[PDB]
Amino acid sequence: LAVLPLIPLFAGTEHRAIMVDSMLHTVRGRSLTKAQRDVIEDCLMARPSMLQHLLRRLVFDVPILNKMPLKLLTNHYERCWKYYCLPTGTSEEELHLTRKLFWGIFDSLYDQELYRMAMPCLCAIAGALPPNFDPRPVETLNVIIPEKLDSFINKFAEYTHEKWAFDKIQNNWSYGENVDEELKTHPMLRPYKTFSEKDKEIYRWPIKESLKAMIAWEWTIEKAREGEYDPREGYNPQPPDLSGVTLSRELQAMAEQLAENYHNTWGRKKKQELEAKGGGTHPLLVPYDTLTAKEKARDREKAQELLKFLQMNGYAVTRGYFLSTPAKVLGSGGHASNKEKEMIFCKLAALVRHRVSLFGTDAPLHILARSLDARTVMKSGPEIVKAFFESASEDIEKMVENLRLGKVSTTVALLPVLTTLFQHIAQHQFLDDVQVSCYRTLCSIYSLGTTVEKLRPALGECLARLAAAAFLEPQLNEYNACSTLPMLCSYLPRWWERGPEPALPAGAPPPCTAVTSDHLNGNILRIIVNNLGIDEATWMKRLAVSRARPELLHSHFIPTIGKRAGKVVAEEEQLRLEAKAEAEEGELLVRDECRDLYALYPLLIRYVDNNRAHWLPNANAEELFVGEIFIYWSKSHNFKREEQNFVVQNEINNMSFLMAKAGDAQSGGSDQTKKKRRGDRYSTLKKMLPIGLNMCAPKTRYALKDVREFLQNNLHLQGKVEGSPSLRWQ
Amino acid sequence: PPPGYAPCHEAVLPRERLRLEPIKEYRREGPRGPHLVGPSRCFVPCPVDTVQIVLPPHLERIREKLAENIHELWALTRIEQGWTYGPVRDDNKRLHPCLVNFHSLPEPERNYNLQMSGETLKTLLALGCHVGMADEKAYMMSNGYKPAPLDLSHVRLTPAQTTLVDRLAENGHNVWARDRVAQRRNPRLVPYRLLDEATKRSNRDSLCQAVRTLLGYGYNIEPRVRIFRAEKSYTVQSGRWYFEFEAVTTGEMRVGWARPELRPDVELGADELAYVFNGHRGQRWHLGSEPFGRPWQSGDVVGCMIDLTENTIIFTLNGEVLAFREIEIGDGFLPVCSLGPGQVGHLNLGQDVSSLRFFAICGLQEGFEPFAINMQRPVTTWFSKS
């Protein structure tokens, strides 16, 4: 019947406490899993904070988890931690302490992997923050307080009588023979000096048990700083303002912990009392972290009263976010222990911790940079394996994550690259994983592009290995490493090589051309025009592969470098792609009564269309108010090739293995300089073009249905309109 | 007049020149037309401890050494101009006994340096800023005395050291402000935060010479909004539309379309009633921020847009398409601008000649209509009143 609910707010939060109690019964069985679904979906529905108190009970339950059903509760608490993290982007820091307790669960150790996944999610929620009861009260009566403190206990007990009396005076209580509640009088409302010492002990006993609990925990309590509504019938105490005292977070943790002591002590006595009666339970008989903070407050007010009375007396009193990133540094120490394992079942926990680590990297202060250095250290321990292994692949994704940590903003790590360079010399002799380390080093070099030189010279030696003779990926990695006038003259030699079109050597020099794109940071712009000639050479290669795609990335680097004069010859090249696509569509007409082999040519032509995207200069078209419009006619012809049939789907197949709209701007030119503004005032040819679009429904004859060249521009606008009709499906 | 006063001509004491302004003002009359402006900006400097806190004598002696080297730097500051060793208590004479080593100096006039340097370290104890012993404690032919300091040009100073030090110079300038409170205007009554930078050059050269002398000592130290709604008559809700937001000062603009229904009390776009983006950050802004585009550099005109039929809101930056897609029409829509206290908008509406650069490049191509194609009259506007 609890499945039916799945289909003010505080009462509903109490019902959440009740469903959580049923989960405590679950902490029949499959049915109890359905009740877990009830609490889970109830958590999905959703105020949230009371649910985080119930998730504090589920946090202590998570501590209990490392029983498996309680881990399932931790999983629902994890998806809830993710939804709440979405709400997040108070007790949340305590929830982060629950995450550190989940790290303790990792310390405790299949199902553990999924539990590590839910722990990865709760840890992600803590990262959003960073942007069968078993009481154990400490032995106290065996503890011996020093006698000098006892005279102070006389004073705090005196204060306790001052407060117990003053609070009765707040309700106008006064001295009397007997406890008549209606009479508003109580017998004990008499001055603290009147007490026999044993009568003072009635106040003292919990207090002394508290100080003995402090000494058992070896908390320091020592001399330091110097110490410091009508009046009613009866004794009239005027107690010092302890409430205005403000405990430090150390001492606030101390108050939370002494309150935890009153909780476990009164709770243990309550449990032994119920065992004496054969009785059931109490609402407070739950672990102290499980408690709503207001439930904690009932003793927290007392422990705070004690520690604040101490701070008012000025005694030193001691136990004896970015800090979570420091806990990640402790995780780096545990990673050093994992390196000690690397010198040779906890290692599987190290792998789950590696996944949690990459996930922590996704979440995003010098200490974090220290953690980046520790990441370089674990990267070195992985480098020892370079020259389960799937876990090492997880460590590799964690290495690209380390590059992301480099993207967030000692030098010894660079020396590991210098060792890496020597390994590249072994590649001259012919360990692909070391090349993958070179790839993560390349992405990390891009992280350097977001913002020891001798090792870079060793990388120049790796460029010499690139000139020494699969390898194209190493060339792209080198181009990423690039982020030198002899290299510029060598780039001129690469331009001479561009004149030459052997092609694989041009792939080898392509990385050098991308390095020239790095050199853009003058003469470098005209050199970028020579690089556009290199793009003309790559197009010469495109007349009939993936290295040309990395070279297309270099064409995007030319887009950074983007002059019009090269775009006229580029217009001739795009026209070659258009005549080629038309010949291929004519081959499809031959198929009607072939093109799939040419679809790869359509893919390289699409890379040329990306090169046209690099040309995106619409302001130059505004200046035209010119051949760019004819290029628009060419791209429109390519759109007509898209309108044909399956060949574009074959280009989608080329996309699975791995434009025209800007031309519409050129169509505005067909309407027309200032004359176009006169057309804005008109509110020219565009209506006739719409008539041509009406003709398109049934094509140069439609232009003849109408200055014939303007009708042809209306026809390109008509095919563009039918292309927009194709766009209507999207 | 006989009356105790000072002339307002002397009110030019801080740094600002004496011009005239129309008070507050939602609309300055700029050259291309009426820039929207505002909403305006605006105290007495005070001494602060520092002095209640006290450095340990072991450090304060090393501070006496740093003060000695700094006094030698003052000797570099003076003696090249024309000065010499030996007694003569006047600046005009071009001779002064204290142009040298601390032991040689009078042991009251040297305190004008050394003890004051202590205050700097006292101030280091005041900020709570970290200031531990990072390192163990450690040539021109000048006329007369020739001091020979180990070079202060070692490690370059951390920017945090320069900032905290400028705070220190401001603090001492404040205690000096109390010193001139005992002296109706004075040359530097004004706090260091608001006075001409050429005057700042002295206090900054002092704080930085002191920080450098500490660097040679091995020491180191580290630590409402105006709206512009369009008139409700003008609420377009039928087909494509457009407007050009020329912009001056870079800043907290929240330019964009918003419904006539909107309540002014909310800053723009927190409510369902607005669709706008910030003038810096570049984030688009509705029901709280999302990332969207580059902040425009100063002078980089906005180009706001609204598709209808296929309802959409598009943003541009000088024709650079960058938004609030798939919006429902409700009532709507009006152009809306926003200004943080200093910023200056310029939301032109129609008159195609007034548009340039940013208009023809994109908006005209997409069939969008500027407002004034419908409007002979200037469009009216509604700034919020404080």
- The Cα–Cα gap between B276 and A637 comes to 38
Chain A nearest CA to B362, separation (Å):
8
Tell me the chain A residues in contact with residue B370 when contact means C-beta distances shorter than 8 Å: 680
DSSP B342: T
Q: How was this model experimentally determined?
A: cryo-EM
Is residue A456 left, alpha or beta, with left meaning phi > 0 and alpha meaning psi from -120 to 50? alpha
SS (H, E, C) A94-137: HHHHHHHHHHHHHHHCCHHHHHHHHHHHHHHHHHHCCCCCCCCC
Q: At what angle do helices A627-642 and A708-727 cross, to 10 degrees?
A: 40
Indicate the residue type of B18: L
Nearest to A712 by CA among A632, A628, A622: A632
* Cα A117 off chain centre by: 15
Determine which helix (DSSP H) or strand (DSSP E) holds A186, and give its type and residue range: strand A185-186
DSSP string covering A448-488: HHT--TTHHHHHHHHHHHHTT--THHHHHHHHHHT--HHHH
Main-chain phi, psi angles of A26, to 5 degrees: -85, -10
- The Cα–Cα gap between A372 and A366 comes to 10
Determine which helix (DSSP H) or strand (DSSP E) holds B304, and give its type and residue range: strand B302-307
- The Cα–Cα gap between A390 and B348 comes to 61
Name the residue among B353, B362, B369 with its Cβ closest to that of A683.
B369
Indicate the residue type of A727: L
Chain A nearest CA to B360, separation (Å):
7
User: What ranges in A278-323 are assigned the alpha helix state H?
Assistant: 293-313
Chain B nearest CA to A716, separation (Å):
16
Q: Specify the residue for token string 């505004």.
A: A622
Whole-Å CA distances, A105 to A109, A111, A122, A391? 7, 13, 13, 20
Q: Token pair for residue B306?
A: 């609204």
The count of other CB atoms within 10 Å of the CB of residue A510 is 27
- Could you tell me which residues of chain B have a Cβ less than 8 Å from any Cβ in chain A? 319, 352-353, 360-362, 364-365, 369-370, 373
Residues in Cβ contact with A400 at an 8 Å cutoff, skipping those fewer than 6 apart: A440, A443
Q: Are A580 and A546 in contact (CB under 8 A)?
A: no
Q: Are A254 and A317 in contact (CB under 8 A)?
A: yes
Residue A399: Cβ-neighbour burial (10 angstroms; 0-12, 13-18, 19+): buried
Contact B365 A681 (CB under 8 A): no
Nearest to A622 by CA among B318, B190, B271: B318
- The Cα–Cα gap between A693 and A695 comes to 5
Tell me the chain A residues in contact with residue B350 when contact means C-beta distances shorter than 8 Å: none
Q: Own/partner pairs for A426-435, CB < 8 Å, 24+ apart? A: A427/A465, A427/A474, A428/A465, A428/A468, A428/A469, A431/A386, A431/A387, A433/A385, A433/A386, A433/A387, A433/A392, A434/A383, A434/A386, A434/A387, A435/A473, A435/A474, A435/A477
Contact A681 B352 (CB under 8 A): yes
Tell me the chain B residues in contact with residue A683 when contact means C-beta distances shorter than 8 Å: 369, 373
What's chain B's length in residues? 386
Residue B308: Cβ-neighbour burial (10 angstroms; 0-12, 13-18, 19+): middle
Instruction: Please say whether the dihedral angle defined by the alpha carbons of residues A449, A451, A453 and A455, taken in this order, is positive or negative.
Output: negative
Name the residue among A619, A676, A683 with its Cβ closest to that of B373.
A683
DSSP string covering A646-662: THHHHHHHHHHT--HHH
Within a 13 Å sphere around the CA of A627, how many CA atoms are in the beta-carbon half?
A: 11
Contact A680 B352 (CB under 8 A): yes
Size of interface A-B (CB pairs under 8 A): 26
Which strands, in side-by-side order, build the sheet including B284-285? B289-290, B284-285, B276-278, B254-258, B334-339, B226-230, B381-383
Chain B nearest CA to A127, separation (Å):
20
Residues in Cβ contact with A468 at an 8 Å cutoff, skipping those fewer than 6 apart: A428
Q: Token pair for residue A252?
A: 């606030």
Indicate the residue type of A461: E
Tell me the chain B residues in contact with residue A622 when contact means C-beta distances shorter than 8 Å: 360-361
- SS3 (DSSP) at B94: coil
Nearest to A478 by CA among A502, A434, A510: A510
Q: Are A480 and A442 in contact (CB under 8 A)?
A: yes
- The Cα–Cα gap between A493 and A486 comes to 10
Main-chain phi, psi angles of B346, to 5 degrees: -160, 75
Query: Biggest alpha carbon distance in chain B?
Result: 90
Mutate to test the interface with A, among B353, B365, B374 (most CBs of A within 10 A): B365
Mutate to test the interface with B, among A365, A616, A618, A687 (most CBs of B within 10 A): A618
Main-chain phi, psi angles of A145, to 5 degrees: -70, 135
Give the torsion through C-alpha atoms of B135, B136, B142, B146, to 10 deg: 170
A288 bridge partner residues: none
Whole-Å CA distances, A270 to A138, A263, A276, A281, A297? 16, 10, 10, 8, 19
Chain B nearest CA to A366, separation (Å):
13
Mutate to test the interface with A, among B307, B326, B357, B364 (most CBs of A within 10 A): B364
DSSP string covering B197-262: HHHHHHHHHHHHHHHHHHHHTT---B---EEEEEPGGG---SS-EEEEEEE-S-S--EEEEE-TT-
Q: Token pair for residue B152?
A: 């202060």
Chain B nearest CA to A398, separation (Å):
26
Chain B nearest CA to A620, separation (Å):
9
Contact A622 B360 (CB under 8 A): yes
Q: Are A562 and A528 in contact (CB under 8 A)?
A: yes
Determine which helix (DSSP H) or strand (DSSP E) holds B312, and give its type and residue range: strand B312-317
Determine which helix (DSSP H) or strand (DSSP E) holds A85, and give its type and residue range: helix A68-88
Contact A619 B364 (CB under 8 A): no
Q: Are A470 and A504 in contact (CB under 8 A)?
A: no
